[PDB]
RNA sequence: CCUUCUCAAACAUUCUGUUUGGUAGUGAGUGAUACUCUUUGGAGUUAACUUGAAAUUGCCUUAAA
């Protein structure tokens, strides 16, 4: 028995069980989203500096 | 937002006073409304023990803070000590994914899996936050269940523990039970026996079974820090065991598993190293 | 027409030449930098000089640091007049002690002491002191 | 931008740390030469913080003892001197919050005195060692297709026999026994353990997490000391609590 | 031993030189210069040797300072945690019987917070002419009070054993300060052959007391450092070669 | 939203319109370095929080219940003065050592005379940007002013150094505030129009 | 924009006695009396006094954003 090597991951099994129960939605992980550049501009306190 | 204001104003003492003046939300009302007829709550217990035994084994990491892992290990040790004191175990099934378990609970069956105590990688692809919320719900549910099971038996809860025992092996010996026949046969199996175990065999998964059967257990790992005057058996799995005492019996760890699966106390001549064990003779 | 040479003073301890180079380099390239130090010790004298490759950069850096409090010191800087030919300002280090004796024979210094005793007696007698022997 | 005040404070803290390292190396050379006539103290010392906090002191006595060094951030203004950087690289304590076991010895005790501010020290409980080994075990690889230059997690017990079996070492429980027992060839197990990278005490930067980090820094200031005397006893924090917090 | 009659003639000549007439206060100081082949091993050392004395030389010093603007005072320093235990009354009730008094007690944390701003550090240190400090805190003092205090023997801290048995036995500190006031004449040991002890104003002690003190000091110095030569002088006076040992030169 | 355009047009009018010298002395604020040093110094003497005040009240009550020297056992207080009327009263006495002045008080008239009265009495003063920063140390949403009538002897040297730094950075650097009326900046489109006109009038 | 060496031994039980070791400083300036050597090349020391930490030029990163 000391030779035994664990295989797989129990977390994947619990996630598959929660999905088979229907309790949780499943989908590809989302990434950071922004449809626009989010334009930056210098502050007036700095822009007026000479 | 109030803590953010207290931190941005520089009055850290006000932030400490605000942190002291708050309490976490309790789910117990949800546990009551969701599971009337407490045995019906036992019907869903299988997912709770599984998720808790899973989270207890994974290494501490970000989004865990390890406090949840500590509460899970505590609840698992308490449930194991209760199953051992009540000798509720009835079947076992070792597997590559872990050591499966089964035990009666007021006559209801309750299967559960115990992950092997080895490091495991985190894929990070799963939504960990939902697993943490499910773990919190299952923790509140199993906490209420263990409280009811302890009050029904009259044992004090939460059980007291000797801190020195936690510093040695942190095993099932922690959280000793005490009050404020046996199932015949599966309970009190190996009665009066005092087993010994080699270091290579697992100590937690095996000691819990021999203790739930009522047999005494000792491990060489306890000798690393610190009698063997009463041992009647010595589990061993080394490819070439060191010269055994003629008066002491020796057997492979597998012998306990089939003996629990059957309860017939199969002869010791089988499972003697290095002889190959029967594959599993699994109950299911 | 002020030169790009710059004078500095009231430097906090540990503001060695490496720090003055790392900080003033952000304003622009500097042909040289140095700091005064005691000849007998490595401690800084809390004043130094610098030279910018561009004269405008020197006055620009001087405009900001002229009253820049730092480590409790009211740091000051004044652009030097034309030229000023930054001077030696040697980077003195803590000189090690070194013995150079004894080398003369012990009999010679012993006779010199035996003579100097009577010489000091005659000298104190020259001052009117009555001490004898 | 360098923000001159920052580089100035850093240069001052580095000069102070270098003066402390010179004061420690002078006593180390005087002890290696056995010129005890001028040394400030004739014996090594060690101290154990305990929970205003209780404190105690005892001579090291030269007896070997297990220890688990844990890298820690700070002092904030001190850039690492090359001497301390080499002493840390010898212990492989890069990536702060990294930890590694060490066999304390009279030859190794002075080295801890130089890195003492950089790392906390203590005596982990055997259960803490079992947890550290079973939670974050990792192993180096060689030969052995998919490629050798790749670390692998410590799961297969058979690899411990394939690699450490020339010494008679067996499944990881035998390594745990060799580490707790401080047995022969224990250093080979230390090199084979791939020192654990303990997780940082708390992720945060939120308001509540900022309060937690403030309380942690306050406890660290209450515990850690920077006397820089070159003779102050090494601190011996209860490592089991730090591991229960970090693990 | 050095002849006592020669020291008597020397102190009489010094009394004559000072009897000739605030410059007189500068001119009245007495000292005993001493030479050696290599003091302190060539390494710098701020430590002072507590020379033995047959009489309370500090008592006349305070008795003269009480009428003088110098306003002689004794500073005290202890472990930073020990200041809370050492109430001023605990020293007052014990030291009034001897008539000595400590003007102030100062924690070592005070030197780094309130006695910084070097102008104030000198204005405060100048008031005291006999600093005292714990054996442990004294090593940290130079980083705190600075090196200017060590330039003068009056401002240099004197070690005191507050902890004979560990954890603050007060009687140790009491008897130690008493002996330091009544039977000790601390003096620094600097680099180079030159050295001298501060005997204080010539007017205070009687000439026989100065002779006995110079004799005990020369005896302890010959026993300890094998002084190459000895001299005594009034501040402006030329050194008097009252005694010298040629035998020390043979080891040079 | 109409309030947004209203405040924006108000700022544009404050920028475009000429200003008397007594106004616009604000925005010649102390430099961020000396201001951060002044706030690091003021932070040591923040007013006691109400919890600490109740703790000191319980301490003095326990002392009077058994001890002697009622209301005298406590150490002398040390906290920055912040009341506007109290700050003006501290001037012309004259116990004040320094008088901070927020540049962004909503009624500009409330503080326009403070710099002049400080120059008349000679008390050191400076116009730190932001009333909220002055109020954060005060344990109040806004205070508009700060002052130090007393300080610990250990901090007296740092206070004199900060006073000399504020003087060198403001009292001398901004001596010209008495003249050279502000608010003369023109609009961007009008600036480009006048520039193109001046270029075409005398250049190709 | 950091903050400084805040104790170690031996005889000894003395309600602390004795002995040893451990201590590199902000710099500049004024200035009186001298010692050692060293080979005139001059280095190490020796009462005294001023000061806003003052000053004109001596060949490892989750303490981020």
Residue numbers in the entry:
A (entry chain q): 406 to 455
B (entry chain n): 88 to 267, 351 to 396, 403 to 460
C (entry chain o): 88 to 220
D (entry chain t): 55 to 105, 127 to 322
E (entry chain K): 31 to 51, 71 to 301
F (entry chain G): 53 to 256
Q: How did the manuscript describe this experimental structure?
A:
To further decipher mechanisms of such an intrinsic quality control pathway we analysed here the contribution of three yeast large ribosomal subunit r-proteins rpL2 (uL2), rpL25 (uL23) and rpL34 (eL34) for intermediate nuclear subunit folding steps. Nog1 is part of a range of intermediate nuclear to early cytoplasmic LSU precursor populations and its association with LSU precursors was previously found to be independent of the ongoing expression of rpL2, rpL25 or rpL34. Structure models obtained from single particle cryo-electron microscopy analyses provided evidence for specific and hierarchic effects on the stable positioning and remodelling of large ribosomal subunit domains.
Starting with state Nog1TAP-C densities for large parts of LSU rRNA domains IV and V and the 5S rRNA were detected. Consistent with previous studies the latter was not positioned in this state as in mature ribosomes. Several factors (Ytm1, Erb1, Noc3, Ebp2, Brx1, Spb1, Nop16) previously associated with LSU rRNA domains I, II and III were not anymore observed and thus possibly released or with flexible orientation. Various other factors (Rrs1, Rpf2, Rsa4, Nog2, Nop53, Cgr1) and r-proteins (rpL2, rpL43, rpL5, rpL11, rpL21) newly appeared in Nog1TAP-C in association with the emerging rRNA domains. The multi-domain binder rpL2, together with its binding partner rpL43 is now one of the proteins connecting the previously visible LSU rRNA domains II and III with the newly appearing rRNA of domains IV and V at the subunit interface. Altogether states Nog1TAP-F, Nog1TAP-E and Nog1TAP-C recapitulate previously identified hallmarks of the transition from early intermediate to late intermediate LSU precursors.
